[PDB]
């Protein structure tokens, strides 16, 4: 659920998911269209696509449990939806950390009309 992904973001990047990642580029937070504008925006694209492969699960509200062995994210057993929602979120957070160095403030509150084109998952 969003409660875990956000805590996971915060743990990983240091930044609060809202506002840092709730309205970035074209795909972080409202994804529907356009070309992702950068690494961080591509993470959100792959993340939206990850949720997309689970049409019968509920990413935002279904809670899963995870632990850290040292720095590592390890998804605990749950229902199959929960394990797979957890895997998509783990990916996004790693992806966010690996591209912190290019995170740009100019892509915060990015306007919608500047997001043009379908890109396929």
């Amino acid at each position: 659920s969003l409660l875990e992904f956000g805590k996971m973001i915060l743990e990983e990047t240091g930044k609060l998911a809202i506002p840092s990642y709730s309205s970035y580029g074209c795909y972080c937070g409202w994804g529907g269209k356009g070309t992702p504008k950068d690494a961080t925006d591509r993470c959100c694209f792959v993340h939206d696509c990850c949720y997309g492969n689970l049409p019968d699960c509920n990413p935002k509200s279904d809670r899963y449990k995870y632990k850290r062995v040292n720095g590592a994210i390890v998804c605990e057993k749950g229902t199959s939806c929960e394990n797979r929602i957890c895997e998509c979120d783990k990916a996004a957070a790693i992806c966010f950390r690996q591209n912190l160095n290019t995170y740009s403030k100019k892509y915060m509150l990015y306007p919608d009309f500047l997001c043009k084109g379908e890109l396929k998952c």
């Binding site: 969003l2 956000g6 609060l16 809202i18 972080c28 937070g29 994804g31 935002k60």
Partner: peptide
Amino acid sequence: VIAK
């Protein structure tokens, strides 16, 4: 706290 996050996202859509």
